[PDB]
Ligand binder design. Structure first.
Ligand SMILES: CS(=O)(=O)c1ccc(C(O)=C2C(=O)CCCC2=O)c([N+](=O)[O-])c1
Ligand SMILES: O=C(O)CCC(=O)C(=O)O
Ligand SMILES: [Co+2]
Length: 344
């Protein structure tokens, strides 16, 4: 039974204690037993005006942010507040539907076996696995010919249209960030555009974190780094919870309305020879309100061999990561963090 979890939104309704499968060992808890989860992020806060990324001072801000945090907030990103609010409303609308309606999109293929795409939870591997306090709807967006539209919610009926339009807007953001990164690494503005390739990948993950009566005991999403090249994250109504690790310390990622958060993923850490790192991040829950986010994961095409860019290497700049085909990295990332296995 334990390999077929009931959605946390159901298990959380009205409870005053988290069920045992969500409770972390005391030393793993946010605050490690206590109620102080994270430190405020010190100034300067990493914020990048995406419309001015060709100005030298703005490019410098992007570089500083990537060296320091591996992530940054973006303003002037070209996405209407109306579209951001509507795509997150469509997500909320879906999660508020009855369990049996959402389960038509279940990622448990016969109610028993996990796959990534669909509505439900991440894979449960071992009965001792501590589960995260969240549900998610995860969908293949690109390459468009690999989509399985049977997993895309039909209600509200504008869900697909809104996701398609939003993702076309975050793809613009992806391209601007990647071009700025090729330039600052002196690899050519185009370098990462060519890396992701014609069949560049895009996955949409709608996260739903129910309120938790004991946020000191659980993770909304456990510490992790993302697997792709860059992630573009939208947090609905800027509800707090997202935290980033730097030097063993957990820092609150600040909220800014109508902004996006851009963070690097493991594929970029490999490609850029670890000059910038893929940041480890987590979500802590709260007692008062649900929290919703939409992560757009952008990665390289499946056949691309991930390796440190030749332009970053030389006699005194050895490769720090071993070569691996992108699809094999993602599979290995699924089944000690996985990117450490690639270090040489
Ligand atoms: C959830 S994740 O481990 O960050 C994550 C998982 C899979 C993918 C994605 O499907 C890609 C391709 O399909 C296969 C090659 C690698 C590439 O990454 C992404 N992505 O496109 O960014 C992220
Ligand atoms: O909900 C968030 O703010 C973070 C989501 C996240 O880390 C992920 O979906 O990989
Ligand atoms: Co993440």
């Amino acid at each position: 039974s334990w390999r077929v979890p009931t959605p946390v939104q159901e298990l959380a309704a009205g409870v005053v204690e988290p069920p045992t499968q969500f409770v972390l060992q005391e030393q793993d808890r946010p605050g490690s037993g206590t109620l102080l989860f994270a430190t405020d992020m010190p100034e300067p806060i990493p914020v990048v005006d995406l419309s001015r990324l060709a100005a030298a001072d703005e490019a410098s801000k992007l570089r500083s942010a990537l060296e320091t945090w591996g992530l940054f907030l973006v303003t002037k990103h070209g996405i209407e507040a109306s579209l951001m609010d509507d795509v997150m409303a469509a997500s909320r609308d879906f999660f508020y539907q009855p369990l049996e309606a959402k389960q038509e999109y279940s990622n448990l293929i016969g109610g028993k076996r996990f796959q990534m795409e669909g509505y439900g939870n991440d894979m449960v591997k071992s009965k001792d696995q501590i589960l995260d306090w969240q549900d998610r709807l995860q969908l293949r967006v690109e390459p468009q010919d690999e989509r399985n539209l049977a997993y895309w919610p039909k209600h509200p009926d504008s869900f697909r249209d809104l996701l398609e339009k939003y993702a076309s807007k975050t793809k613009i953001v992806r391209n601007k960030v990647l071009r700025a990164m090729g330039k600052t690494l002196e690899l050519g503005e185009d370098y990462f555009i060519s890396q992701i390739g014609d069949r560049a990948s895009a996955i949409a993950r709608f996260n739903y974190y129910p309120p938790c009566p004991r946020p000191d005991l659980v993770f909304g999403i456990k510490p992790h780094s993302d697997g792709g090249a860059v992630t573009i994250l939208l947090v609905d109504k800027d509800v707090g919870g997202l935290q980033v690790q730097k030097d063993g310390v957990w820092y609150t990622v600040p909220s800014m309305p109508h902004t996006l958060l851009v963070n690097l993923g493991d594929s970029m850490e490999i490609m850029n020879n670890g000059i910038f790192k893929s940041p480890v991040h987590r979500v802590v829950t709260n007692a008062e309100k649900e929290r919703l986010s939409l992560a757009m994961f952008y990665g390289v095409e499946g056949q691309r061999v991930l390796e440190p860019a030749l332009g970053l290497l030389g006699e005194e700049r050895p490769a720090r990561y071993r070569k691996i085909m992108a699809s094999d990295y993602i599979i290995g990332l699924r089944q000690q963090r996985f990117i450490e296995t690639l270090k040489i």
